[PDB]
């Protein structure tokens, strides 16, 4: 009368593993002998990464950019002499870092219209209400609406290597390739209508803090608006109040010459972005990469620390059972 089925009788076939000290303690050695080599591998690699940061915020009269903390006739320029000790050979990546800048604030992270930036004609002319109070200006919809956009970083940094004489020679920095391939070719599109861009943004208005509309960010027709890599890079919020956004790409030379030879350099910056109002700091990061990215000791030191704390507890309790 009662269904004598394996499932119903609670008698299915099972595996029933029995893990025990005598079975797990060899696992504390497989970890130690795999995490220490990896830890030293990615700890030596993070040490072969050359880098330099030039804080150019001012805030100390002993700095060149103190003339740009509160200017009067200001298109503002700086010049921050810095020197490279050891050459940079591989690919180099110029960044810009902002500190005390809350790109992850809740009222901030959402102040955007993902459909407007996706080339939607319906949303391009009536932006969302999350992007407020940056939703309309002089009774027109702002072209890129939102606070995330309005506060785009707009400093211009250019490096100069000073040759054997005093003549400074410029370095070639390329703007293309700094934003996720996916959020420039897919997630960020231009308005669909036409081939001329100034007429796709007709019933729109440039953001309040902008100085040139979003169809004037670049002259290159593939880097012109809503697909600009500088724009697309600032739109990807930071996740912490101290962040870095990719700025340029100094590419390795065809010859095996050093990408950035050693010597004295010039960081010419046009000081546009104000950050002292909220006790912020601006810096420039020049760095090389590896299979693991930038220079971060945490991941190496964390594989050693955990590969040694695990290879010891294995030995600790392995002999404690050798008491027999």
């Amino acid at each position: 009368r009662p269904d004598n089925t394996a499932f119903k009788q609670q008698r299915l076939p099972a595996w029933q593993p029995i893990l025990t000290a005598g079975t797990v303690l060899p696992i504390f050695f497989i970890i130690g002998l795999i995490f220490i080599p990896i830890g030293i591998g990615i700890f030596v690699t993070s040490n072969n990464i050359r880098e330099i940061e030039i804080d150019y915020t001012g805030t100390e009269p002993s700095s060149p950019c103190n003339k740009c903390l509160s200017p009067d006739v200001t298109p503002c320029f700086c010049t921050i002499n810095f020197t490279l000790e050891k050459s940079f050979e591989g690919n180099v990546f110029m960044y810009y870092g902002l500190s005390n800048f809350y790109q992850n604030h809740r009222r901030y992270v959402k102040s955007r219209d993902d459909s407007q930036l996706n080339g939607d004609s319906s949303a391009l002319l009536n932006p969302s209400k999350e992007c407020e109070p940056y939703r309309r200006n002089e009774d027109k919809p702002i072209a890129p609406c939102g606070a995330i956009m309005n506060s785009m970083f707009n400093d211009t940094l250019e490096l100069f290597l000073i040759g054997q004489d005093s003549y400074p020679i410029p370095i070639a920095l390329k703007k293309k390739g700094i934003a996720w391939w996916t959020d420039k070719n897919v997630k960020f599109r231009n308005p669909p209508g036409g081939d001329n861009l100034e007429e796709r943004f007709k019933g729109t208005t440039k953001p309040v803090n902008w100085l040139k509309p979003v169809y004037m960010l670049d002259s290159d027709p593939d880097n012109n608006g809503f697909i600009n890599e500088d724009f697309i890079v600032w739109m990807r919020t930071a996740a912490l109040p101290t962040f870095r956004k990719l700025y340029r790409l100094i590419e390795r030379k065809s010859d095996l010459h050093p990408t950035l030879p050693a010597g004295r350099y010039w960081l010419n910056v046009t000081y546009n972005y104000p950050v002292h109002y909220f006790d912020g700091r601006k810096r420039m990061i020049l760095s090389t990469i590896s299979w693991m990215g930038g220079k971060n000791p945490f991941l190496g030191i964390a594989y050693i620390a955990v590969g040694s704390i695990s290879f010891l507890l294995g030995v600790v309790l392995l002999v404690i059972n050798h008491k027999y």
Partner: protein
Amino acid sequence: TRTVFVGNHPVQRFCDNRIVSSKYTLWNFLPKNLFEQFRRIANFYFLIIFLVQVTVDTPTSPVTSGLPLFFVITVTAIKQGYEDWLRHRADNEVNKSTVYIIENAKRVRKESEKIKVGDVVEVQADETFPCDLILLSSCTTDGTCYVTTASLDGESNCKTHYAVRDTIALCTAESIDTLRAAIECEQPQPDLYKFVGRINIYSNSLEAVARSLGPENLLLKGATLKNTEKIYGVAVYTGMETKMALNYQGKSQKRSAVEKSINAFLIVYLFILLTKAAVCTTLKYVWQSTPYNDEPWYNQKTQKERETLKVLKMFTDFLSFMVLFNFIIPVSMYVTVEMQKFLGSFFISWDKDFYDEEINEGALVNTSDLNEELGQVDYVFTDKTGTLTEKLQDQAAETIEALHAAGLKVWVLTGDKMETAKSTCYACRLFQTNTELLELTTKTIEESERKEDRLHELLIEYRKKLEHQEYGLIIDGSTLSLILNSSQDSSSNNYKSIFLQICMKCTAVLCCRMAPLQKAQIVRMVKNLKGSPITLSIGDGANDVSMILESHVGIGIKGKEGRQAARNSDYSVPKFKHLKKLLLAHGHLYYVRIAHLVQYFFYKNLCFILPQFLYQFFCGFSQQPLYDAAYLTMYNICFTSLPILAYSLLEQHINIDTLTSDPRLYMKISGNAMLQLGPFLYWTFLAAFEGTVFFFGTYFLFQTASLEENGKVYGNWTFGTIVFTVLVFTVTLKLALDTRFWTWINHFVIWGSLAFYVFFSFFWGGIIWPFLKQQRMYFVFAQMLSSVSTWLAIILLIFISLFPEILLIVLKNVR
């Protein structure tokens, strides 16, 4: 002290023969149930958080807080409304019966619920009585009557009652002669063997006959009449006052030990949630005291958040921090304990070992809400005739040993007389040869204050100075009435304490000649003493319905008497021996499956929300969710919902073929061990330790300016997608280290829930739909996976996190 006129004829304030076993009216069921439910702290909190999400601010959606709270109400009101409607259906078959009454010189026929005190009822042979009668006569002479009280004392022998002498001649012969009489009785009491009254039969001209009335004339209610063609009574107690209706006590409600823990864990996580929200709100306004910490020229409040009253936003921010951290009290734990209880209860019905070819039936689950209470029993209150004896049953002595080996105390509460009631226990292995009987029967206390001496001669000088195997108590319904009822006279040395101690220090107790309610007053004395012993009562009669309703879990045998106790119990086995497999195997499994689902549901959500609470110190305490609204929503629904539901439905903590062979394994889970303060602080610190490795393990990983060989930076949806991948793999592998019984369903759900979080993350992220107002997670999971330093940071954090669980194993497995 109540005056009854026999024929309602003169020489009021009485009930009317209507038993009411139900609790709800079929008109006011919703107002009274929705108040008994939303008066709990769990059901009332879920409704207060759902109202805030709908009114103030919600991180994901209000539909995911009101839908599970509505399923959990609607489902508990159907159980409670059907389990109660079944009592209406039973009250009707006892009322609305046929009962012939002699109204006016003829044989009227009303229904049982329409009888009134003082009217000559007539009962034929084998007809239950409609009320507590007073035998007036019999068709045949000798003024006798053979009653069988199998629903009052559970026995089935032919009792004998005697009709009033002066009225034994009235046999359908002018029984309606305006028969002058006045039955002066005592107020209704539950004694079931005491009745003091007086009748005043009057004569043709004038009479003074006053014949004393005793329990030999009172024909109680629910006692079939035997070997007698017809009798004639006089309803004296009718409805809710019959001695059978005074020994009921009703059913209040039964909560498990696990559901009383779920309520303690919810009041601990209710203060963890009010501290997370009150610490983040105090810090949020200490951080905003700096003018450039709010409105720092790059995000500014529009005009409505600059004008909102200062004190109205402090209270609204507090509610926004509670709607953000509200996930630490999971609404899905109650949605899953319902599915688990209803689905898991099918293994008792399906069991082929709970099958009797005699009755051609098996086990039966009347309430799936006590599955986990079958594995926490401390006391077992039995019944002698029908449950233990049929001579003893098949294995009534081998089951009482397996109940002592497991650490339970088996008492036998009976209604038979101590002569034969005692002989059996000597065969059930419950009373050994070298066991001294400490008896409190009426054949030992023939005095007023004598037993007060006995309770001392047996406690303060005989048993508590010492040997746990030697003394066994015996009591009586006559004596227990003096100890239980008369315990409000002395308070310096109370009888109920001096006597309760003698019971816990005795091997076994046996109470003879118990009334249906005294079985429920003994089972309630145990429920009170020295903590909270979990009691179980098993009986096959209708007199056992009052202790089956009073205990923590009541088992009703399906036997010769009827299905009166089988339908008032929580479970029903057609045998006594089926109690060993029911609580040793089924009870052990049912408890460990639900006590781990409760520990794991609270842990699994503190690992989830702790990273999101720490994140506030790095935003402006702005209530910015660390994860995407599609991850917040699917964590408890899709990514972590199935693995623990298949653990709760098929997981032999110990092989069940071994759980029945070794009863000693029952004591390992005996005091709610798995849900104590020890195991609770381990799970709560594992979750607070892991939740700190998740966030701070990736906080340091994000100090590099890039994690790719192309030098591209990650945003804040990748920061939270890395904390969520380490979290889903850690809480899923923590349950794979806890699993000891791997069926093909456990591989499918555990490794399928992981392969689905990855397949879904590629599906949800990788397309622009469009039906969303945002495209924030478009390619976040795909880019995060193109970096080798992120695969390693995830492999290292779901190892540092699972270290205290792998290390604790090697400790719990050596020396």
